[PDB]
Write a protein that binds this ligand. Structure first.
Ligand SMILES: CNC(=O)c1cnc2cc(OC)c(OC)cc2c1Nc1ccc(Cl)cc1F
Length: 153
């Protein structure tokens, strides 16, 4: 009972782009860019499409960096999130849904991000690949988790 999602991190040598979500689920937190994979679409094509819809950026080469499953206690559907890292074109676009901002790598706003990010961002920043699972109670509490580095996602 899992649904496919993507998440894209635009990570440059000294900064990362994140978007402040204005509405819907996750509003008020800085996030990568992502959403649901569509019918007939590959996961990677979904990742490229969502980065444009949410940030206005065009990505050619995407690299898969992780897979994280999110469980919300009581909720039937698990989120199977395929995480990718990016060479981009365009300038980030602020829209009604998302306010993008560049962050220096020592200024990541973990306090205003989903709590799981604190666990897997140190891996992302060090160019590691990973598999994770986080079980949440509500939006603020991690009940339990697993996180492992892998050679292949
Ligand atoms: C830079 N880290 C993130 O951006 C990020 C981190 N953790 C998340 C945890 C979540 O629930 C437990 C979650 O539920 C909607 C969203 C998360 C999330 N963003 C995100 C946005 C849109 C999708 Cl489709 C998928 C995502 F993971």
């Amino acid at each position: 009972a899992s649904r496919l999602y993507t998440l894209v991190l635009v990570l440059q040598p000294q900064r990362v782009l994140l978007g402040m979500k204005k509405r819907g689920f996750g509003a008020g937190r800085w996030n990568g860019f992502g959403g649901k994979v569509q019918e007939g679409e590959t996961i990677e094509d979904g990742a490229r499409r969502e980065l444009q819809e949410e940030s206005g950026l065009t990505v050619d080469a995407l690299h898969k960096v992780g897979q994280i499953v999110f469980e919300f206690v009581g909720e039937p559907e698990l989120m199977d999130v395929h995480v990718f890292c990016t060479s981009i074109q365009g300038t980030p676009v602020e829209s009604d849904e998302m306010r993008p901002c560049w962050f220096q790598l020592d200024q990541i706003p973990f306090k205003d991000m989903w709590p799981d990010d604190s666990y897997w961002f140190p891996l992302l920043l060090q160019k590691k690949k990973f598999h994770g699972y986080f079980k949440f109670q509500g939006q603020d509490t991690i009940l339990d988790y697993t996180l492992r580095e892998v050679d292949t996602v």
